[PDB]
Design a protein around this ligand. Sequence first.
Ligand code: FAD
Ligand code: LMT
Length: 421
Amino acid sequence: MRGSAHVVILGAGTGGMPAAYEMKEALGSGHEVTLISANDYFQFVPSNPWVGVGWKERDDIAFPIRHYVERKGIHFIAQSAEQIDAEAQNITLADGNTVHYDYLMIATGPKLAFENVPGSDPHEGPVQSIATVDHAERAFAEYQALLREPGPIVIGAMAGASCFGPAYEYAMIVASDLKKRGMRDKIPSFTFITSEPYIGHLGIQGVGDSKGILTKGLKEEGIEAYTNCKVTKVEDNKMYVTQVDEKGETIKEMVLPVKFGMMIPAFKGVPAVAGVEGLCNPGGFVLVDEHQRSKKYANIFAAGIAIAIPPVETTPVPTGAPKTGYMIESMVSAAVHNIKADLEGRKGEQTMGTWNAVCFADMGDRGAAFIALPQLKPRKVDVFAYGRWVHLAKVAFEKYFIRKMKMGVSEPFYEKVLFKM
Ligand SMILES: Cc1cc2nc3c(=O)[nH]c(=O)nc-3n(C[C@H](O)[C@H](O)[C@H](O)COP(=O)(O)OP(=O)(O)OC[C@H]3O[C@@H](n4cnc5c(N)ncnc54)[C@H](O)[C@@H]3O)c2cc1C
Ligand SMILES: CCCCCCCCCCCCO[C@@H]1O[C@H](CO)[C@@H](O[C@H]2O[C@H](CO)[C@@H](O)[C@H](O)[C@H]2O)[C@H](O)[C@H]1O
């Protein structure tokens, strides 16, 4: 309402959870902040691959949201938005109810676009998913069924995928956990299929020696690897793979039996957001400016996977650049600062900053991690590291993040630069 704006954050994930906290902190008691989200619980996404192999439980990485935000003055609706009317500024919930907003912050993350590949939905076939704790729990279940009836494994990333790290990570920890169970030997074949033009491309044209290190690792574990692949369909427990050359022309087609597989799907914008006329690109990604404001509606902001970022390269098989934790946080904090400025008179000049990708992967005792920035080469930072410290770092950041998501954040987040000062 007037002189008392109502700000809605849509999606309680890696961007939205902090965004609601930071928004309430910024706007104070004279403004209503509402967080709306499909599930009643927060989950630490980067931990899912480990749930997928049974190295972590749901309760280690997920918690009920309601108590933690409400004690901070935030309203929480554990309900999915089905429809967003940007003219009337009304959101229609699953249950029929309607919620009005003066400002809307979209943090809905990705739709997992299994529809791109018939058969590929985790509920339709043997190709599973580790993107959500629901899916990962399910992936682990099928993994036990593989352990009872050893059969070919296929792990990888589909065409259009943008988040490759986890595919590599999942392939290695499965290998690792097979070995530990002392049952690696029973596996007919272990294949890695990716839409990357080469191993370790990672949708960022490689970082450091990600190519040689990831290549040598898959080899070490006895995993055969194919690049430039699209999967045309999953069917009859078989994966139909088409492999192209640098020009798109086909150079072979395979038919891979799968007893247990996991392919990272392409990400699209969720439907309620994609369905807002004029809001999104053809993928369902919110077209926003440098201040995270939608280009069509001044009172709509967007942060996280939800936003549209232009491609810098066109790969033989379509691939996308990832949107990762640190940059998502800058998107969040900028959007908060820019709405507050609006509520207070000015255009917020705050931006996301320099594009960057930061990713950490834990293999058990040691980890791999990379930092790339900016998006185009030659970069200012281009580092791929492996070691125990990466593992210590992963473990530490999860603990930190889950804790912060419970106690709240003001709060220029990554003050993870006090370990210097
Ligand atoms: C398996 C995997 C591992 C990852 N590993 C890392 C990594 O190690 N490091 C890193 O920096 N990044 C990592 N990422 C990338 C990225 O940081 C995560 O995907 C992160 O969760 C993105 O946050 P987000 O806010 O954009 O979307 P999300 O975290 O997915 O949150 C979106 C939220 O919106 C909700 N939602 C969607 N539609 C609606 C609707 N209609 N109504 C209400 N709610 C809705 C969803 O339920 C969800 O709660 C990883 C990604 C994946 C999938
Ligand atoms: C974060 C997303 C990126 C992808 C996710 C993870 C994918 C899996 C990584 C596979 C790495 C396995 O291969 C591993 O690599 C490095 C090579 O530099 C080797 O490690 C080598 O360099 C490291 C330091 O960086 C030394 O500590 C080590 O003594 C040395 O042998 C390991 O002996 C080898 O076992």
